[PDB]
Design a binder for this molecule. Structure first.
Ligand SMILES: Nc1ncnc2c1ncn2[C@@H]1O[C@H](COP(=O)(O)OP(=O)(O)O)[C@@H](O)[C@H]1O
Ligand SMILES: Nc1ncnc2c1ncn2[C@@H]1O[C@H](COP(=O)(O)OP(=O)(O)O)[C@@H](O)[C@H]1O
Ligand SMILES: Nc1ncnc2c1ncn2[C@@H]1O[C@H](COP(=O)(O)OP(=O)(O)O)[C@@H](O)[C@H]1O
Ligand SMILES: [Mg+2]
Ligand SMILES: [Mg+2]
Ligand SMILES: [Mg+2]
Lengths: 372, 372, 372
């Protein structure tokens, strides 16, 4: 009778909802905003901190901080604030009568999940909770069993291969290059056209510009030549103070960092080579099914050229006798939450919860014994 | 009214069917596979063991083990699993109403036969059972009564001479050099070209390469010279992951171990010398008939150069006035099963079964006093 | 009158010197570094590539590549750079008047040895060159004739048994698991404590951490329990930028892959099982002498728990009436070079060189008819 709660706490967004639903009920940015100026009007119910959409609406007088950086919770008081807001203000629910399912990026510090379990059991004390890997939930949402999931969000980009329900943990690859780094690089290269964005609110503006006008090119050199030749790739964006900026090759130079990380001085390979190397680390007999089941999840995969570019690159890397399919569902921005709702509604999962009694007996160390 | 069952349990393959048929109904690999990677998805009916074609089709996440090694059952739980699979899932029969005929290589340990009888009477209890030697079944299938049978399979290569229905057990020669050793030698010599196959799953790939591309050279030195001079003996093979590997002299070096065991460090003589030595241990009055009635059986005799090579070698060893003939029927891979089905259907064999009453009276030791 | 050169090119280090000596003259890492950032100061003697110690010293602005992977030369221009550095800059010698001895792991591709011969005779033209197996040299340096050598370096781990100077190639075992794999595994498992090492410059830092702080436990479960109980096994390491990290069970979990390869997803057996399997594949009359003469060589055998652990494991596997003795000399990091210098100084070896006239007459294939 007691329904469960699925809460995906990503680096940039929080997606919370109820188990068994098709879409998350609450989606809001994971920011805590604090006033930086002097208050002069007495009364009027001024608060010392702001969370979520309230921080975004008043961001012109606030400094915004992200409690999660690269999938790791850096500030715990702010994260506790975010959880309090998502339980009592958005979902409008009492945490002490609902089991909770949370998510974790692969190859993360163990202290992160230990303190997550401790806060959930000692501050928002729940009957049960479960910490799950995001790529497995994305595969649950896709409805299939074999596939290699590339999950790219705001802090982390990771590839995880799964075959017939079994993971190959030695082939999991993690890259700390995601949407926030793309926002930073776009911010840096906008200074070539005279536009100066420095503050935290201007970072939100640049992120909005990236979400609106950026795309992944099929061929980088040809698009550069086209942008140099004619003014056909230039788009105009209107700022909140009515100013209009015009961007050209920066529309496709920003997500190209996903394929050329050396644009921001990193030594790693692109996401295509990382995926290919993750497939080559697996057994030979499962590579054929891995090539045809590339599943893309997360908001950083929403650029409207990324599937074709990925297919072209992996086809250039893979043998010519192989069929390569890139799976990009239209609702892949919410794939982790949809998979968590699918998993938490299964009758075969109800014995895999971490109960309050087990936590009391074992302490904040059972999260490694019961969760993979 | 009760139909008899014929099950040939070799080192590599299980050939099971009903007596009176022309071909075995169920031929499947004799392996048990178990998961080695980490299962991350719940439900979906995951099993803790896979047997037969289900293990081979899913081998990329499994470790594969052969219960039978060199014709001796090493693991008995897995052997019971194989027998259960071949009685229920493949043959779709209830063993409580069908006598069973089984096969055993010459010069085997007694305990193997004893435990086979005990399992067949106490786990899959049968009205009666029998254990037969493979070479007499091969000579039954060949249709003749006199001849020398060279049976080479996956674990054992044995020569048995028979004259007018009487065997000479002192001339029986057993050699533990068969198909698995050839697969291992091919795996070793494929590293000369940079190809690495290490795991148990890749052993099956190398086995397929051996079954498809290898052959026996009529003269080994001239074949080596031909391979060194021109690239006319090279063949390409496409791997499961789409890689293409080219092999040259390894096509005829791998089965050359049958004629030169010293390639794998074995001091024994070749198969031709073993056949000649078995013939020369017999009486002088039967060697003329044994020379002209050489019968081959098993899957190791399926290389497309072995009959001519054996004829040439034995003609080199034998007197020039004798006629040497090699009998290589196209169905010789299934010769043991065909001979068993012919034998189990005879009206004079129904008195030679080991019934349940006699097993209760004598225990698992009547298999020596009733089976030769 | 011409002094012979002894050069050992492993996967990680180059040990070069003159025959007849006791220690190699030049021991330097086998890496080539190339700049990855933008040069802004004109002139100043900037080079396009760096080799050896100079590449390691300037690694903060360089990308470092290993020309040899798993004992196989993957890049040949970098290999020519390494050999030019070790001939003209380190040894300070002219190659045209010194014969050269090179080493190679067992079960390598033939093309590697052929191209080594071709490069040594056509680019660094030597009067003579000879390629030898590393384990035979280790037995030469050990002073004895009978023994089984376990040589583990940076790319390969191979077992070679020798009895009275005769080798048994069918019992030679090779495992592609060595120091670099342990470095990668340590990089993976240091992420549990929040440390992120990604770039190739940080791989050397992790290698230094492994060389200074890692060790092999005598009992794995007991040491895991001890680490879980108290913080007595924890050690601190200072990073190049002054940061201090602390590691606990990661000290002994990293080399345990040599005994449990499944930690990195490999299906193979541990080094103790591989040594026991190599002993069991030999003749029965030499196993007693192989048991008492386990010879350890290579830098991966330098952990301060590995001899006792190997003795315990082999004594567990071997019959109780056998004397198992592990021979781990203090200078076993340079056993290959010492054996090569011993062999190249023998008067009975001077007729086994491959002169330039023989190479001209036969081509780059006499290295198979002359070298074992
Ligand atoms: N349509 C889009 N095009 C490009 N980038 C997008 C788009 N939508 C979202 N993003 C990026 O995705 C990131 C967040 O995606 P998501 O995975 O849903 O959140 P989280 O990373 O917190 O899980 C943001 O940094 C944003 O810049
Ligand atoms: N066409 C072929 N060429 C060469 N070898 C073959 C061929 N077909 C099967 N084999 C080998 O025969 C062996 C098994 O043959 P068979 O005697 O029928 O089974 P078992 O040895 O279990 O009795 C396998 O090891 C396989 O490698
Ligand atoms: N004290 C040590 N303890 C453990 N490992 C070591 C130690 N010193 C060196 N190594 C390892 O030995 C490897 C190379 O050893 P060596 O065999 O001398 O070189 P190569 O493998 O190139 O022949 C390196 O990868 C290094 O990690
Ligand atoms: Mg996410
Ligand atoms: Mg057989
Ligand atoms: Mg070495």
């Amino acid at each position: 009778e007691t329904t469960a709660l699925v809460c995906d706490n990503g680096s940039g967004l929080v997606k919370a909802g109820f188990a068994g639903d098709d879409a998350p009920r609450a989606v809001f940015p994971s920011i805590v905003g604090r006033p930086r100026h002097q208050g002069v009007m007495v009364g009027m119910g001024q608060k010392d901190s702001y969370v979520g959409d309230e921080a975004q609406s008043k961001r012109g007088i606030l400094t915004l901080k992200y409690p999660i950086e690269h999938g790791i919770i850096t500030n715990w008081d702010d994260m506790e604030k975010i959880w309090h807001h998502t339980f009592y203000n958005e979902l409008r629910v009492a945490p002490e009568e609902h089991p909770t399912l949370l998510t974790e990026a692969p190859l993360n510090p163990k202290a992160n999940r230990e303190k997550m379990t401790q806060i959930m059991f000692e501050t928002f004390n729940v009957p049960a909770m479960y910490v799950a890997i995001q790529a497995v939930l994305s595969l649950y949402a896709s409805g299939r069993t074999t596939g290699i999931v590339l999950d790219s969000g705001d802090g982390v980009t990771h590839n995880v291969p799964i075959y017939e329900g079994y993971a190959l943990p030695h082939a999991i690859m993690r890259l700390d290059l995601a949407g926030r780094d793309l926002t930073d690089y776009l911010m840096k290269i906008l200074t070539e056209r005279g536009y100066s964005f420095v503050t935290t609110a201007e970072r939100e503006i640049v992120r909005d510009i990236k979400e609106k006008l950026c795309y992944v090119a099929l061929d980088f050199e040809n698009e550069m030549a086209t942008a140099a030749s004619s003014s056909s790739l230039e788009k105009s964006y209107e700022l909140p103070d009515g100013q209009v900026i015009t961007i050209g090759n920066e529309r496709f130079r920003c997500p190209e960092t996903l394929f050329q990380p050396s644009f921001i001085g990193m030594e790693s390979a692109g996401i295509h080579e990382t995926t290919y190397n993750s497939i080559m680390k697996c057994d030979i007999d499962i590579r054929k099914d891995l090539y045809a089941n590339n599943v893309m999840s997360g908001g950083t995969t929403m650029y409207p050229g990324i599937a074709d570019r990925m297919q072209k690159e992996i086809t250039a890397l893979a043998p010519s006798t192989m069929k390569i399919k890139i799976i990009a569902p239209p609702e892949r921005k919410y794939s982790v939450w949809i998979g968590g709702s699918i998993l938490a509604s299964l009758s075969t999962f109800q014995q895999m919860w971490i109960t309050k009694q087990e936590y009391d007996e074992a302490g904040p160390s059972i999260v490694h014994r019961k969760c993979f």
